[PDB]
Amino acid sequence: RPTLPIPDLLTTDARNRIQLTIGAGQSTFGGKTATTWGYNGNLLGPAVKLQRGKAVTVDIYNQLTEETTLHWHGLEVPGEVDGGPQGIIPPGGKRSVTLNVDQPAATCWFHPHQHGKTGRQVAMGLAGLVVIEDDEILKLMLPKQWGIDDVPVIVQDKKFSADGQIDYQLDVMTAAVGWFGDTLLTNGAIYPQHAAPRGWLRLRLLNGCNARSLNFATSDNRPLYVIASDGGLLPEPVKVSELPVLMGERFEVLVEVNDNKPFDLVTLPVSQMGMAIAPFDKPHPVMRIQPIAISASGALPDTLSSLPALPSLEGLTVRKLQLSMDPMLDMMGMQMLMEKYGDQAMAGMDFHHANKINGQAFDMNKPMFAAAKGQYERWVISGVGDMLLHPFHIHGTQFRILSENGKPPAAHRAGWKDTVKVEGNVSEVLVKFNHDAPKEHAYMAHCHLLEHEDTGMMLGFTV
Ligand SMILES: [Cu+2]
Ligand SMILES: [Cu+2]
């Protein structure tokens, strides 16, 4: 097996600048070349290291022949640097942003947000990581040797045509059920191995799929200890036997490594339409962990952080967001899925503006509302009316889940989140925006099933 590719950990230079070049190159999958896009390389991207309380300037050079944007998913930053669809970077041009980092330690990520094309641009290879550090986390003495006992694990599916190229289409079927493939990548490699020292191994897990939900576990059923969600540390570790991860979500887990006992990180079949077709009808390996007989220094502390109680809900502004899909698109798309793949597409379970929030397909010129700055609001997001999965993401914040799809959140999901599950039911989140966003650079709120976002399931809002 190939070794797990380890993204470079990138910090500022003497001018306080980080350079990111967006460009086309080539990658090899199963022996066959494909055109791919990457940040500072051919595919995927570096891990940008940020420090709470410090500002960094990022110089972003678009060397593609089409327009793109660069969005920092999970970062609490003003709209002007948020890199939503209004944050255009012309082909052959450059945009610079200054990020004033003001949130706790977390694994965030970055990716394109081009209007109507975010799914294609992510599918072509663009994604990178953000590692935010703070003073609190350093004192815990977690595993922290990058590429050794602290590793990022970006998991993505793709499908390829016979000629070896990535086979991306936004069409009636994918607008309805999402773009998904038959090949699983881990930091861009197929089923890599990672050598790890005896003791604790920290995995920063990102579901970077367009549409496919994941469910992590180990091949020999050793537990995962969840220590962090999208927005940072949980108050205490939470032991789990499996870990569902929606599109765009991150979790950090610790797992024990013992001499002479290799095991695989795997993903278990999910109950999502289209996602349990071979090879994903069965547990699917993500990466092999190969124990090395050298002692690892990291700890799993009993206490990680302090999590504040939920405040009172009385008096808070309520904003209701009703997700919907044109009945026609939903029917046509699902029929096409069933015709192609049959019953296995439900195992365990104009289209360009067909998906909507509050009856409206995304209008970039018309933010739907102006949210308060520095005030808690309660946002109620409903998927009642269809049975599709909508991981709902809100820019400019780390929120607390009050109810996830009609039930209180599980413990590992009760901390700081930027995504909430919505699937045929109603979710409620407690959100606060610390930064402004004007109409010309609005925050987005949308489904992170990228084909739904690109066909209208997104709104802009100001702060
Ligand atoms: Cu985001
Ligand atoms: Cu959706």
Side-chain angles (χ1 to χ4, degrees), residues 39 56 64 79 120 134 173 207 223 257 259 278 292 339 357 400-401 422 454 458:
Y39 299 111
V56 308
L64 306 171
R120 178 164 181 266
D134 65 17
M173 190 183 82
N207 180 343
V257 180
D259 291 3
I292 300 308
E339 278 170 11
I357 310 185
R400 305 294 297 278
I401 299 175
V422 176
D454 282 337
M458 177 156 72

Side-chain angles (χ1 to χ4, degrees), residues 47-369:
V48 171
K49 189 177 192 163
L50 304 179
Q51 188 77 34
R52 186 175 194 164
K54 300 204 179 267
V56 308
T57 298
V58 188
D59 294 323
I60 308 163
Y61 297 86
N62 180 12
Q63 294 180 357
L64 306 171
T65 60
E66 74 180 74
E67 279 190 7
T68 192
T69 78
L70 196 162
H71 167 58
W72 311 88
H73 184 142
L75 277 65
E76 298 163 27
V77 297
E80 289 94 334
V81 300
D82 182 52
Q86 291 158 303
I88 305 301
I89 310 166
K94 181 198 178 175
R95 292 291 187 276
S96 295
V97 294
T98 295
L99 307 178
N100 289 288
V101 179
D102 199 7
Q103 65 191 274
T107 304
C108 290
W109 69 299
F110 67 93
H111 65 82
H113 228 307
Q114 180 70 14
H115 188 228
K117 299 175 180 61
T118 292
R120 178 164 181 266
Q121 302 200 337
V122 176
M124 285 303 296
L126 294 180
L129 290 162
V130 178
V131 169
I132 308 175
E133 304 275 11
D134 65 17
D135 301 322
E136 190 274 346
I137 197 167
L138 273 214
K139 300 174 158 192
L140 297 181
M141 310 302 288
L142 292 169
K144 56 155 172 62
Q145 290 302 148
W146 189 253
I148 297 180
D149 66 359
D150 176 15
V151 296
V153 188
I154 303 176
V155 182
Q156 305 183 110
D157 62 332
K158 296 198 195 294
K159 60 175 167 175
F160 303 90
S161 33
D163 66 359
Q165 300 305 327
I166 296 170
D167 185 14
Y168 187 85
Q169 57 283 126
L170 183 60
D171 61 22
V172 166
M173 190 183 82
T174 66
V177 302
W179 188 71
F180 66 88
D182 66 354
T183 298
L184 203 69
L185 308 177
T186 306
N187 296 357
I190 301 180
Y191 192 10
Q193 58 176 314
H194 180 69
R198 175 183 49 231
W200 292 121
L201 168 63
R202 173 177 189 184
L203 308 174
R204 302 177 187 246
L205 302 169
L206 167 64
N207 180 343
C209 297
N210 282 37
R212 174 179 298 283
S213 62
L214 298 172
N215 187 1
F216 295 105
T218 65
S219 60
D220 64 1
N221 325 293
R222 73 183 59 219
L224 300 179
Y225 298 82
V226 189
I227 64 160
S229 56
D230 303 324
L233 297 166
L234 301 179
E236 293 178 342
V238 177
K239 187 183 175 191
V240 307
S241 52
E242 61 189 75
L243 183 50
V245 187
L246 306 172
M247 300 81 80
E249 288 191 327
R250 295 76 67 210
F251 290 98
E252 302 177 41
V253 300
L254 271 54
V255 62
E256 185 179 349
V257 180
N258 296 286
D259 291 3
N260 304 314
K261 199 124 193 307
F263 62 98
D264 297 311
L265 184 67
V266 307
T267 180
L268 305 178
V270 302
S271 299
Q272 186 186 349
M273 184 181 310
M275 304 304 159
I277 301 304
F280 294 106
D281 62 322
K282 302 216 182 48
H284 190 126
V286 172
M287 96 172 176
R288 165 61 64 83
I289 291 79
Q290 187 65 40
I292 300 308
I294 288 168
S295 175
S297 17
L300 180 68
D302 296 333
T303 305
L304 298 171
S305 62
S306 187
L307 179 67
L310 263 10
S312 184
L313 277 16
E314 172 76 322
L316 311 184
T317 302
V318 176
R319 301 196 189 285
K320 335 171 258 141
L321 301 71
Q322 176 69 64
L323 312 182
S324 67
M325 311 179 68
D326 193 296
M328 204 65 135
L329 171 267
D330 199 11
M331 296 218 144
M332 286 175 56
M334 289 180 42
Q335 181 175 300
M336 289 179 95
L337 183 73
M338 299 310 294
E339 278 170 11
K340 187 161 185 196
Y341 299 112
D343 303 328
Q344 191 62 209
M346 300 281 259
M349 228 272 318
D350 192 288
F351 75 82
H352 289 100
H353 303 87
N355 291 123
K356 303 184 182 8
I357 310 185
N358 292 342
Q360 300 144 257
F362 179 58
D363 188 342
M364 192 165 72
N365 299 161
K366 186 40 148 100
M368 201 175 272
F369 51 83

Side-chain angles (χ1 to χ4, degrees), residues 176 247 323 325 355 386 388-391 422 446-453 457:
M247 300 81 80
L323 312 182
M325 311 179 68
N355 291 123
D386 64 71
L388 299 178
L389 171 67
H390 312 288
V422 176
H446 60 100
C447 177
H448 217 286
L449 195 161
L450 298 183
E451 289 62 50
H452 292 174
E453 172 195 327
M457 197 176 283

